[PDB]
Every structure is written in C-alpha cells, then in structure tokens.
Structure 1
Amino acid sequence: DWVEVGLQVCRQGYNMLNLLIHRKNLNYLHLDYNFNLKPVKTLTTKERK
C-alpha cells in the first residue's frame, strides 16, 4: 500500500539523516521525527562550529 511505502521511506530518510548527523560522533544535535534539527542543550560556540 502506498501509505505503507510512504511510512517506510519516511523512517528510512530519518535513519539516513540521523546517520549523517552523528557523522563525527557528535551527539549534541537531535533530529526529531518532523525533521527539525535542534541542539539537545545550550551548545558551546566551538561545538556550534
């Protein structure tokens, strides 16, 4: 069903973007399920860079 494929692709794209986010083993950027990227805390300027 097309809805099932859409859900699968949304989950797979979330997984791929999550893999890209934790590329350099940095865990202070969180990607929600609505695909909004936000820091998990008040990140320092070096970590922001």
Structure 2
Amino acid sequence: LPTNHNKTKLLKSLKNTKYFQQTTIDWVEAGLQLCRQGHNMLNLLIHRKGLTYLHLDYNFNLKPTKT
C-alpha cells in the first residue's frame, strides 16, 4: 500500500526553490542533455577520486587508459 501522507514528491519539492526553472524543450534535446550531464557527473565522480586514467567513454564505457 502506498503512503497516504506523502504530500512531498521529488520534482514538486524542487520547483519551490530558486534554482530549478521550468521550460519546454524537445524530448530529443532533453535526452541529449541528460546524456551530456550524466557524462559530466560520472566524469566528475571519477575525477574527484583521482581516477583520471579511467577514460569514461561517451557511450558510458568505463575503460582504463593504461594498464
């Protein structure tokens, strides 16, 4: 059974800040931007740890550059 007092959602809790903004774009542009942003976030997760030799390819294949 779902919770009944779940007035909080995820995106409805993010509209109410000053940081997220509403717009209308193509679905393909939204998908290409989530690919670009997912590549940036996983690349920064890799690069904060110092794993600069793990060249995360653009198709999200993690490959070590060297042995």
TM-score (norm 2): 0.58
Structure having the higher helix fraction is: 1
Is 1:12 the counterpart of 2:37 in the alignment? yes
Is 1:24 the counterpart of 2:49 in the alignment? yes
User: RMSD in angstroms over aligned alpha carbons?
Assistant: 0.9
Q: Which has the higher contact order (CA 8 A, sep 6+)?
A: 1
Q: Percent identity?
A: 86
Which consecutive unaligned segments of at least 5 residues does structure 2 have? 1-25
TM-score (norm 1): 0.76
Provide the C-alpha distance between the structure 1 equivalents of 2:51 and 2:27, rounded to a whole number of angstroms: 35
Which consecutive unaligned segments of at least 5 residues does structure 1 have? 43-49
Matched length: 42
Provide the C-alpha distance between the structure 1 equivalents of 2:58 and 2:28, rounded to a whole number of angstroms: 17
